[PDB]
Enzyme design. Structure first.
Site, PDB file in Angstrom:
ATOM      1  N   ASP B  13       0.829  -1.194   0.000  1.00 40.72           N
ATOM      2  CA  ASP B  13       0.000   0.000   0.000  1.00 40.72           C
ATOM      3  C   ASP B  13       0.868   1.250   0.000  1.00 40.72           C
ATOM      4  OD1 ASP B  13      -2.407  -1.351  -0.082  1.00 40.72           O
ATOM      5  OD2 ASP B  13      -2.482  -1.587   2.098  1.00 40.72           O
ATOM      6  N   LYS B  16       5.039   0.200  -4.001  1.00 38.97           N
ATOM      7  CA  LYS B  16       6.204  -0.420  -4.638  1.00 38.97           C
ATOM      8  C   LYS B  16       5.825  -0.921  -6.048  1.00 38.97           C
ATOM      9  CE  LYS B  16       6.923  -4.847  -2.657  1.00 38.97           C
ATOM     10  NZ  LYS B  16       6.057  -5.997  -3.030  1.00 38.97           N
ATOM     11  N   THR B  17       4.561  -1.310  -6.207  1.00 35.14           N
ATOM     12  CA  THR B  17       4.041  -1.799  -7.481  1.00 35.14           C
ATOM     13  C   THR B  17       3.961  -0.644  -8.465  1.00 35.14           C
ATOM     14  OG1 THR B  17       2.639  -3.348  -6.263  1.00 35.14           O
ATOM     15  CG2 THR B  17       2.152  -3.029  -8.597  1.00 35.14           C
ATOM     16  N   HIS B  53       8.948 -13.777   2.332  1.00 35.86           N
ATOM     17  CA  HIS B  53      10.264 -13.933   2.917  1.00 35.86           C
ATOM     18  C   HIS B  53      10.730 -15.303   2.495  1.00 35.86           C
ATOM     19  CE1 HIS B  53      13.361 -15.225   5.549  1.00 35.86           C
ATOM     20  NE2 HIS B  53      13.344 -14.128   6.286  1.00 35.86           N
TER      21      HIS B  53
END
Lengths: 195, 373, 195, 373
Positions: B13, B16-17, B53
């Site tokens: 949110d 990064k996209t 991760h």
């Protein structure tokens, strides 16, 4: 003062740097009416991701010191990064512990079917129509007599074991706020020896 | 022109996209996983993505991923997220070379003192994990606006738009700050032996694809692996596709004869490389990933003592697993870290990938993380 | 030594001193037949208390190292003294771990509707005749087929995860022998993340 | 004639139940919580039973149980049972004075070299827990046969039957190896202060029921608790029901005046006793039992930091709970052990029982197990 009030503050509530300032202004520069703003505001952010997907997370557990009660609990988040976070971890430990003591029957309210809720709801108005006031009065009588019931059997509606002042759901919402990922309680498991 | 791998980590949110998309459209007007690509004047880039991760950590082992550097995306309006600690934590683990920062959504914040603060936070956070929190560049901008502008004017360029210039500030920061990978052929020599025979009068010969480094004739080499001792001699000739070669370099399917080496003195599995470069060992630590049953991996789990197969290049040696404290049993699909001991010594080095199998069937795959004995 | 024999045989199987002598006697003074006799004989003892009531015990658990799988298990014994014993403790830890991996569906066989399996058996005899097999031939397979099934879904019939050579039930019986208290598995719980 | 409490612990299939029965019928022919009684020439006995570890602790706390010694019953045929360790463990915990052993079912074992072994096992086991494993007496016999004989001849006597004589061997062992518990009046003086008042001309006087010991006039005494320092003076007079008493003894409701004590230097909650006998403290360790909701206890559980009222005899004092490592939350019905720190100093001593409450409402009850400060 400036970022010193905001700092010490967010530092505690772990919220949005700008949302913190916003709340200090938004409610005069006094902490009390700020942190409470933040808490109150957080409740909204929660309902926003309420239907976001969450298949990540972990299995929380609590084994009583005397091994007579054990609890399993699936706590989902969106990313495994979050799952690994100390906050998620604690929230999970704490939720498991809570269940151990409070012994909820359901996770959420909607978890409760009709035929079931009804087979009950009427046993409610059955004894009300007796001790006086008929149906009309007893129908609204059995309006708050249900709220109490849910606070008992429903995990979310239960008063948090480490602060009877806040309901479980709230504890969760609060977390969601500081993290930014929808957090859901998939299911729980509780065994009490010989019970 | 150089090529590099970079990835984006941080709260989704936080954009990064969006930032990823902005980077493509922004450089497009200057230079004619499901990764995306874009290039500056200096280098060419491919974008990795870190949603998990584990998910990632898994691939970093199966050779797939290989971030040469990474970008951290935090919203200046919210500041760091608790998970931000966990994002960085990953980087430390896989050991990303360097990190660059981009304070997104800077347009949604009036006071510029907070920004200095937010940045203060992050900087320290990285310091906590060995990263040069102070030396790292922190770009302030808005991916969204930068993108909206590129949408309106796909040809927009440097200096024209305010928000696009910030994206450039970033692209630049990357080029600089980010060390460029250290090429292969530059690294010490090494080649995994596949076959070995002879050519009457010539001597004993061994084939294989060079992995790294270069090699001509008369060069001095070492034969590490399988044997009780590391023998060393000198190259007596090189040849590709059976047609003499000037020099053999990384990525060359070659063949090499040696001086003072019987036919019985070398065989598949063994390996030859720059003397002193790498040594033989039997005990080591490693990060692994067990194939799920569907991926054809084991059907059940296993415990300490497990004695399988570890394909190291051309070979397939035997060894015993030692689950560490805290780990009691391992099941298909798991990501783990345990120590191992093999029957025969092998040329081992941190970073060396491998595979595991139970009778040809691959059941797991990992990489070496530490040498012990 | 004759002494050292029992003295170290007993030490291993942790069984009734005299019972040890007996076995060595009863089966020539050599282990194999002996230990196998003790083993063979402990099962009987076990069977002798199967109906004895046992409301004591503990809640065993196993949480995978990666927190993606968790298991709860109620293991009862007769006295809480036993419940506290290192062996009960281990047995429970081990049972929990086993379930985590083997994912049984039931505890015991009777736990299953007899006609459901009875239906499933003719369901096995079906496909055999269906594939060119005579009735009497196809009758046999059904057993090994059903038997196999139970070894999959039923916890007791499952091959112990730390020794595929012995079935879970056996591991239990073995314990009962060394202790002298009926030991039962009341129920288990298993959560696998997103599964 | 002296009275003593003894109990039986051990595996039920070893005959502790049978042995109990055997003891009653066997003494019967010489002397003209579910308990049975029987008496030797020397003392009178009552039988306790330990079916549960946890359960015994609760009764031990709710003042019910009080074993002055205990008998361990093991089958010579099987030898010790793993739980035997646990049986003994309890004794140590509650702190049983002394232990005596009875090796039952001895008729079911041919080789006597075996018995010596079994006994050496046991002896060691107790040593492992501070008990004089070597000094302790170990009787060999059969409760069953001994009983069967008593059934046949209820009047059987010493010397007559072989197995009965072994039971006597045991009765005797008991008589010797277990000293008799000091009587209350024989123990050091102590009296909890209830009320206080000055009687012009005489001095300041304090009432209360003597818990233990005796006390005449001129007896030197101490005033322990609440105050910053333990004051010490002398008894100037004793009186019961307002009518002079030569000597007051345990269980007497009396009144006492002291020398050099202002009316403000003494008050309810304090306690006076044989000088040096007890001291004031604030931090201690204790074994507790929380009342279940049904018994009126709390509705929920609690954690470290809990701050209730602690009642010590006549007093009521505030303190904070410190749950130890391994204990994270406490729920109604639990048996626990935690440390406690109070606001004011109090006359404390190991063994001192007490109660806990939330507004007059008793929610728990425990006994002090260790003094820390």
């Amino acid at each position: 003062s400036q970022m010193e009030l905001i700092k010490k503050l967010r530092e505690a509530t772990g919220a949005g740097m700008m949302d913190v300032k916003r709340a200090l202004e938004d409610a005069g520069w006094d902490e009390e009416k700020a942190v409470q703003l933040l808490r109150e505001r957080g409740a909204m952010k929660a309902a926003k991701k309420a239907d976001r997907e969450a298949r990540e997370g972990i299995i929380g557990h609590y084994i009583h010191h005397n091994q007579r009660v054990g609890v399993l609990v699936e706590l989902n988040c969106e990313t495994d990064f979050v799952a690994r976070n100390e906050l998620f971890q604690n929230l999970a430990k704490d939720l498991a512990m809570h269940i151990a003591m409070m012994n909820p029957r359901y996770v959420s309210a909607e978890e409760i079917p009709a035929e079931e809720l009804e087979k009950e709801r009427q046993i409610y108005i059955q004894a009300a129509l007796n001790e006086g006031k008929p149906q009309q009065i007893a129908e609204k009588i059995a309006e708050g007599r249900l709220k109490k019931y849910l606070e008992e059997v429903v995990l979310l509606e239960q008063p948090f074991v480490k602060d009877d002042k806040v309901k479980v759901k709230e504890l969760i919402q609060q977390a969601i706020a500081k993290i930014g990922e929808n957090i859901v309680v998939r299911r729980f498991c509780r065994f009490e020896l010989g019970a | 022109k150089p090529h590099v791998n970079v990835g984006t980590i941080g709260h989704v949110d936080h954009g990064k996209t969006t930032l990823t998309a902005a980077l493509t459209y922004v450089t497009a007007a200057e230079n004619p996983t499901a990764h995306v690509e874009y290039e500056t004047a200096k280098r060419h880039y491919s974008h990795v993505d870190c949603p998990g991760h584990a998910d990632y950590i898994k691939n970093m082992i199966t050779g797939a991923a290989q971030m040469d550097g990474a970008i951290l995306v935090v919203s200046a309006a919210d500041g760091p997220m608790p998970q931000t600690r966990e994002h960085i934590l990953l980087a430390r683990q896989v050991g990303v070379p360097y990190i660059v920062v981009f304070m997104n959504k800077v347009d949604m914040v009036d006071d510029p003192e907070l920004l200095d603060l937010v940045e203060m936070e992050v900087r320290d956070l990285l310091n906590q994990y060995e990263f040069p929190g102070d030396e790292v560049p922190v770009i302030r901008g808005s991916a969204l606006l930068a993108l909206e502008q590129m949408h309106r004017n796909p040809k927009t360029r440097r200096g024209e738009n305010e928000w696009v210039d910030k994206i450039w500030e970033l692209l630049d920061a990357i080029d600089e700050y980010i060390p460029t990978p250290v090429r292969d052929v530059d690294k010490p020599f090494l080649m995994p032996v596949e076959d070995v025979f002879t050519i009457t009068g010539r001597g004993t010969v061994a084939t294989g694809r060079i992995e790294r480094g270069k090699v001509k004739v008369g060069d001095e080499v070492e034969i590490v692996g399988l044997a009780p001792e590391t023998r060393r001699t000198v190259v007596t000739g090189v040849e590709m596709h059976r047609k003499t070669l000037q020099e053999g370099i990384a990525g060359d399917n070659v063949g090499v004869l040696l001086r003072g080496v019987s036919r019985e003195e070398v065989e598949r599995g063994q390996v030859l490389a720059k003397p002193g470069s790498i040594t033989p060992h039997t005990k080591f630590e490693a990060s692994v990933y067990v194939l799920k049953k569907e991926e054809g991996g084991r059907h059940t789990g296993f415990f300490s003592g497990y004695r399988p197969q570890f394909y190291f290049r051309t070979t397939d040696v035997t060894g015993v697993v030692q689950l560490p404290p805290g780990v009691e049993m391992v099941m298909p699909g798991d990501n783990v870290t345990f120590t191992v001991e093999l029957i025969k010594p092998v040329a081992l080095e941190e970073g060396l990938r491998f595979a595991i199998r139970e009778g040809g069937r691959t059941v797991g795959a990992g990489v070496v993380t530490k040498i012990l004995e």
